[PDB]
From Swiss-Prot:
Changing residue 35 to L: In NS3; characterized by a defective GTPase-activating protein sensitivity and a strongly reduced interaction with effectors. CDD domains: H_N_K_Ras_like (cd04138). It is linked to Leukemia, acute myelogenous: A subtype of acute leukemia, a cancer of the white blood cells. AML is a malignant disease of bone marrow characterized by maturational arrest of hematopoietic precursors at an early stage of development. Clonal expansion of myeloid blasts occurs in bone marrow, blood, and other tissue. Myelogenous leukemias develop from changes in cells that normally produce neutrophils, basophils, eosinophils and monocytes. GO terms for molecular function: G protein activity; GDP binding; GMP binding; GTP binding; GTPase activity; identical protein binding; LRR domain binding; protein-containing complex binding. The gene is KRAS. This is GTPase KRas.
Amino acid sequence: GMTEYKLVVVGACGVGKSALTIQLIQNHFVDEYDPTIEDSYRKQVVIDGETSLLDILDTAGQEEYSAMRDQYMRTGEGFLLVFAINNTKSFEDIHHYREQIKRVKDSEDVPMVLVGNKSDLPSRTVDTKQAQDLARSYGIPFIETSAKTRQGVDDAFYTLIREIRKHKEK
Ligand SMILES: *CCC(=O)N1C[C@@H]2C(=O)N(C)c3cnc4c(F)c(-c5c(O)cccc5F)c(Cl)cc4c3N2C[C@H]1C
Ligand SMILES: Nc1nc2c(ncn2[C@@H]2O[C@H](COP(=O)(O)OP(=O)(O)O)[C@@H](O)[C@H]2O)c(=O)[nH]1
Ligand SMILES: [Mg+2]
């Protein structure tokens, strides 16, 4: 068949996980989507001439850490680690998400992409240079996105898939 990849979108409440994922699937910006609704979505994509089926989990639920998520997270093949460029706390939380991913996957080498969302807003408080410095330190790609304009959205998901395909060849 065509290969199938499980992708997981993680990050703090309100960063735009749902807006991103719905943009990629439904081709429109859905604002104020309920913060607690979780869903999976499927999408066929062609990347570098190979067609793949993406199964994308948009994480939600209660606004705390819960180990009830972790069996689900262990099924992820690649993760988008999303913060909002107008929200310093959401950037500060990225460390915790990467540590939990490494813990559940029991690996130092899990496909991941750092996503700085809401790039359309003028209210940036997270310096692109500091987020780039963090991504360099982790050894993972960094893409600034806007779910609203769609800037960066496809490149974030496609770069993740590329990282997964490379991982699977090691
Ligand atoms: C508005 C809800 C929302 O977007 N949330 C819910 C919660 C949340 O708010 N916090 C603080 C939270 C904390 N820690 C989380 C995780 F550690 C993980 C995670 C594992 O448990 C294991 C492996 C990878 C992980 F990323 C997840 Cl999936 C979610 C956590 C949350 N949520 C963030 C977000 C979905
Ligand atoms: N301007 C702007 N607002 C966004 C963007 N992404 C999400 N939002 C808004 O930020 C809020 C949270 O988005 P949501 O998708 O619910 O975040 P989630 O909790 O991470 O799933 C909503 O009010 C969205 O309309 C973005 O790229 N630009
Ligand atoms: Mg959401």
